Design a binder for this molecule. Structure first.
Ligand SMILES: NC(=O)c1ccc[n+]([C@@H]2O[C@H](COP(=O)([O-])OP(=O)(O)OC[C@H]3O[C@@H](n4cnc5c(N)ncnc54)[C@H](O)[C@@H]3O)[C@@H](O)[C@H]2O)c1
Ligand SMILES: NC(=O)c1ccc[n+]([C@@H]2O[C@H](COP(=O)([O-])OP(=O)(O)OC[C@H]3O[C@@H](n4cnc5c(N)ncnc54)[C@H](O)[C@@H]3O)[C@@H](O)[C@H]2O)c1
Lengths: 318, 318
């Protein structure tokens, strides 16, 4: 059998597992015509996000049995065209879940400890600022998690048990009782999470309800001493309302890994404040997370090519 | 009875607990002669670090039974002069261990996630470094803890279970089995902890055995990819040897909260490197930490003034 890598994988480990059992062709920097001239006599396809997979390419693929995406995004693959030709469309999500949770923990602790601000002062000979800064102790503070999914649960679990925090959670579409498996308390009114929390960490899916969910109206309800952490999606915060929340001191600070205009401009107003800490959308980027994405893509190809059902099919009708 | 507060307590809680049972005089911004003219008819003394306590002031104190420091440091109190007049010198250590534990966690995470370096770049318009930086995933990495005491145990406990790290410990004066209560494994050969660790965090007592314990010879054994965290004491590291470890890249980075010489100068050679992040001896400085020290200093005074032997006597000979 033959397997086509439409673009490189996140790590070479998945390229060797496939080449171990199949014949692998790699298309680096894929063009539209290049897919058709190689997808014909091919049994498995790996699509690196965000390159497109036409209904044309699926049709020119006659022996195609499994198409695998690089991560969570499946919006560039014609899912409808594959359910007709019997092709199984498989996903690879959540494979950077421990990486993002470690990252948000990093940012919660940095905000509480004023890590970035204290580092700059010491480096500027201003060691003496220690008489003007009070680090925050996380123990006993309440951490409100918006989105009790893969990442929110793991973040809640660590903050509730190891860090001894009171953890509240807002997630309408999660089984009531899930929060107890993780030592959080499920909350039905998001206003209650805002008024009780000293730290707010966003982990929801970007739906048509969470887009710009965190408004200036939400910020006014939060404690002046509270912080915001966002490793989810940029659009979950109305970025202009966050700029005024910091400037008007409605909020004590914020840690951001995702941006609404992404990439953010050079002239971003948030960069002005020591209040605000950034990372360039790297929360889920660790070497181990890349291998898990590569290994999960190679394993789900071999499962379909041999009979067995893979775990992440978007095509249950096959 | 009368108690003199040579300086304010870290929180008003210890001053009221003392004022509940004794007559309290407070000397804010204490001068030496002010100590001399008030320590006379007084049974207990609280000395706020770092103000001095002379053999003169101790000599002028006739009814003095207990002197209590504000924290751990007793080097500004004439302990020899107090053992002679029978006065009990009391310490206040271990009252901020959760603060240091949270602080060391902050710095381990920041080093793995390159938090400070990523923040400055994003703020400097260099969002594009995300193609050049790899955050480290803590899960599965080995954390070597030097000193399995109050802070060392707490750091181990969180890292072994919540962060899913293999935790090693080096502590010759600890019962093997203390590491087991905390899901670490106690190790007898420090060379094993240096060659196996991806992160080494120092939490030992500063003795003549740990003084400059971390030499250029120690750094040579660590992995080129490993990191160093020091929230203990500045002298446990030979500061010049740390600079050559960073400069010659024997080590991947370092986070320090304590310095030798302390305070660090404006021209510190470590400030050059993005590898190295600093905090100005604030690891144990949180509001909750101040209250426990205030209460513990006020309680060890009332313990001596009522019969009971206090827990932290530097004067066991009475
Ligand atoms: N490198 C990165 O920054 C990175 C990496 C991975 C994921 N993420 C982002 O983190 C976020 C969380 O990821 P995940 O894997 O936990 O997703 P998930 O699918 O496992 O869970 C998302 C949760 O959001 C909840 N939710 C849905 N609508 C909500 C609403 N209106 N209000 C509150 N909660 C709602 C859902 O019930 C679900 O429990 C996602 O937006 C994802 O894109 C970022
Ligand atoms: N950065 C801060 O603000 C701050 C605050 C409090 C304490 N500290 C420092 O952190 C360190 C740990 O504090 P603690 O409360 O856990 O003290 P601790 O006495 O409870 O633990 C220190 C450990 O050092 C161990 N040790 C002694 N000699 C050793 C050796 N040769 N090798 C390995 N281990 C050895 C002892 O067995 C002890 O267990 C101390 O040096 C303390 O001064 C720093």
């Amino acid at each position: 059998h033959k397997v086509l890598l439409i673009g490189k994988m996140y790590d070479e480990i998945g390229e060797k597992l496939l080449a171990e059992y199949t014949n692998v062709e790699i298309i680096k920097e894929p063009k539209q015509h290049q897919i058709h001239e190689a997808i014909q006599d091919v049994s498995g396809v790996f699509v690196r996000y965000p390159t497109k997979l036409d209904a044309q390419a699926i049709g020119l693929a006659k022996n195609l049995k499994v198409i695998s995406t690089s991560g969570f995004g499946t919006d560039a693959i014609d899912i409808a065209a594959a359910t007709k030709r019997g092709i199984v469309v498989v996903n690879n999500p959540g494979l950077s879940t421990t990486a993002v949770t470690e990252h948000t923990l990093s940012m919660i602790l940095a905000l509480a400890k004023k890590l970035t601000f204290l580092n700059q002062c010491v480096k500027a000979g201003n060691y003496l600022i220690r008489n003007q800064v009070q680090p925050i102790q996380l123990e006993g503070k309440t951490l409100g998690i918006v989105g009790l999914g893969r990442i929110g649960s793991a973040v809640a679990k660590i903050c509730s048990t190891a860090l001894q925090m009171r953890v509240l959670a807002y997630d309408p579409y999660v089984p009531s009782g899930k929060a107890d498996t993780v030592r959080a308390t499920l909350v039905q009114d998001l206003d209650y999470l805002l008024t009780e929390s000293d730290f707010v960490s966003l982990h929801p899916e970007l739906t048509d309800e969470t887009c710009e969910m965190f408004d200036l109206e939400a910020f006014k309800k939060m404690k002046p001493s509270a912080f915001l952490i966002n490793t989810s999606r940029g659009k979950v915060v109305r970025q202009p309302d966050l700029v005024t929340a910091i400037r008007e001191k409605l909020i004590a600070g914020a840690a951001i890994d995702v941006f609404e205009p992404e990439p953010p401009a050079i002239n971003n107003p948030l960069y002005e404040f020591d209040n605000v800490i950034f990372s360039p959308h790297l929360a889920g980027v660790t070497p181990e997370a890349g291998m898990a994405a590569a290994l999960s893509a190679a394993n789900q190809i071999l499962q379909v090519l041999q009979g067995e059902k893979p775990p992440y099919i978007i095509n249950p009708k096959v």
